[PDB]
Design a protein around this nucleic acid. Sequence first.
DNA 1: CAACGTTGTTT
DNA 2: CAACGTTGTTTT
Lengths: 250, 250
Amino acid sequence: CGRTSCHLPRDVLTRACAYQDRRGQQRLPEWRDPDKYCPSYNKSPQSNSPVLLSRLHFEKDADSSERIIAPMRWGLVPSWFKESDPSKLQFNTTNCRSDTVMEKRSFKVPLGKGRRCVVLADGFYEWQRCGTNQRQPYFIYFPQIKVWDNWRLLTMAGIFDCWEPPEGGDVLYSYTIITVDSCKGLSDIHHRMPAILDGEEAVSKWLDFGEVSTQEALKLIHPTENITFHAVSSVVNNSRNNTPECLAPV
Amino acid sequence: CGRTSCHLPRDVLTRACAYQDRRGQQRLPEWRDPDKYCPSYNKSPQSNSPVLLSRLHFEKDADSSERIIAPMRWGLVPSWFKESDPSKLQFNTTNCRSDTVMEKRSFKVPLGKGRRCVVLADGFYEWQRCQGTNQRQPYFIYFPQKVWDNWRLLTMAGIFDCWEPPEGGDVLYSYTIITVDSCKGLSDIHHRMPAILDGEEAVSKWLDFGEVSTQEALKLIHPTENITFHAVSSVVNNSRNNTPECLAPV
DNA sequence: CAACGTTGTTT
DNA sequence: CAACGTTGTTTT
């Protein structure tokens, strides 16, 4: 997808990410770079979103089932990118097609290093081509079986890479969201949907690059029907608008 | 090492190579190209020395435990060598480090074709760096045993290759002697020593590429303490000198 | 990390 | 040779 919501405050988001480690012990993920978390109802590519990844990416002797939550830049910048401005990337890595993921060098190399991450969101927006060229926006989320008390975060399959700015600076962590065919439920809205990891097991297996090979992890990548949506107002169309009105029903 | 002695006449050398085949039957090895054996007390790289190798290198239906003795050129000339004069080779292949042998493509490829051979010598010379001068002291180094009646030949682990002169001629067979760390007994003389195969079992297993894989053969390659030496005169320093005086004690 | 262009070794 | 080290555009 091309737009998400991820508005919850840091403390609330962290509690909504409670998980069981490989011994069945309930835990919260540990933050890296929490100050780069910027809550918004209206996230575009080139902004930072919180993602889950295995602690083994940061500590050599770590339990790969332990989770880090870290803000990462949406728009995978390949490790080999030669220019000094990540936004000057000449091709689009907002998304990564599931069907070609192991063929494309921007995605296959980091995937092969185990750089699998789970992109968090309240949900994603998608636009239906209406006739006129005016498109209708939808907010799309897990069914929620106030509402933001115990909201179920959407967990999208991503790949990340690490890029050292040639002229010096912090290693950039950036991600792409894997896309698949839209399920029947969404097929009238759009032809594509994100690779959604539905439940603790799918999330754990996507993250655990120490225990779960690329072949096994890619079996988790497919359309899913376990999703709902409502139409929203035009307010979300302008990426500068960050209000509860962006995902409010009409 | 960089210098050996191999001075015994062809008939005496062949009797000193008595071995048991795979049925326990005592045999002498069979010569190829005996006329290329030129006995000397003072052998340098690019000269020919007799080596043992499996008969299976020469006959498709042979008992791989049967041994050929054949003169080969010291200084492995890789099969890929493109120039017409083998002495133009820009790499020194007198020796092959045990620790990196599987990383070095000039040694790994022939090793993988089973081109393992046992380099024969009376013994080898090594030069000791004596602190406070650049004048080095030479030693003759041999198996523990005037004494040329029943002398025990030194049996060093070698790899060989086959090079066709591009402009035509006989296939060249050339060898490298594998090197390892010097044992404690020799550590004051030099930091390196040849890979010595101590006894009939080590020799048989190094030769038998039909029955003993690369992994198993490489377990035979290590420092050994079963070695003695004496200092010799400067006469051996000049590689043109071929006299009994080269390995005579002082 | 599959494709591709280069190089090969020790004291 | 063939094993090395080096290279590198993507989606709706």
